[PDB]
């Protein structure tokens, strides 16, 4: 978490929103994925959301399931994912790194051991996509014991009791997915929630400026990035230039 607190403090001083891209680790392959991630950071990403390839995903779907398939086709293990994470952190000491996980990969070798490994490689937060707040206690406890921020989704069908739980249990940032964003943000501010990142359908600069204007702390963009990766599988170099151009555009919109 500390990295998130420091990031949001600096952005607030700059009157700035965060722009946070998502990619799957090892898509389309390890070295290229490391290249992608360094390109995202150099283009202006304020934080990263990184997916660990899973045998059977769900809160994602299409553009991302292919990314998962590509990473499996390259033979990427969770252990190789943790090695990439350590290297990313060794290159980039301050950027917040969040993981998007599914519960079985956290549970598989022991929950406390998973978050211990996150802390060892320098991850800052973990969102377990199929652990609702109702089931989250052992995950949250292990996360906090290893200085990892537990991330929760605030969905469109949220209600007031969910808002209070997400505000009370989340750290680092709140994943915002009906009330107008403004009112949802108001209630999240009233309940002292972690700074909200809007994460639904963020694909153009005007959506980034809109989220910050609504009172969110920034925006998370997932499918859009992985689509650029999808489009240029045969052109590694065009892939990176397109990724640079998109992220630079999205980050500019947050200022």
């Amino acid at each position: 978490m500390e990295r998130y607190e420091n990031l949001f403090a600096q952005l607030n001083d700059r009157r700035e929103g965060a722009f946070v891209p998502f990619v799957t680790l090892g898509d389309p392959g390890i070295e290229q994925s490391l290249k992608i991630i360094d390109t995202l950071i150099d283009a202006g990403a304020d934080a990263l959301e990184l997916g660990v390839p899973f045998s059977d995903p769900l809160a994602d779907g299409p553009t991302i399931q292919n990314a998962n398939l590509r990473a499996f086709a390259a033979g990427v293990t969770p252990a190789q994912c943790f090695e990439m994470l350590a290297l990313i952190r060794e290159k980039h000491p301050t950027i917040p790194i969040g993981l998007l996980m599914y519960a079985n990969l956290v549970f598989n070798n022991g929950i406390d051991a998973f978050y211990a490994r996150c802390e060892q490689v320098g991850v800052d937060s973990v969102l377990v996509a199929d652990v609702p707040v109702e089931e989250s206690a052992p995950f949250r406890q292990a996360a906090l014991r290893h200085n990892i921020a537990p991330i929760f989704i605030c969905p469109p069908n949220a209600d007031d009791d969910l808002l209070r739980q997400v505000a009370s249990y989340g750290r680092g940032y709140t994943y915002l997915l009906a009330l107008p964003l403004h009112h949802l943000i108001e209630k999240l501010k009233e309940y002292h929630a972690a700074p909200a990142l809007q994460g639904f359908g963020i694909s153009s600069p005007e959506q980034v400026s809109a989220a910050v204007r609504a009172g969110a702390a920034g925006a998370i963009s997932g499918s859009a990035i992985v689509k650029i990766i999808e489009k240029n599988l045969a052109s590694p170099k065009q892939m990176l230039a397109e990724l640079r151009s998109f992220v630079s555009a999205m980050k500019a919109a947050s200022r």
Binding site: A59, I153, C154, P156, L162
Partner: peptide, 10 residues
């Protein structure tokens, strides 16, 4: 248990 994304709890 109920190990589903938050959006499915309702």
């Amino acid at each position: 248990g109920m190990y589903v994304p938050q959006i499915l709890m309702p």
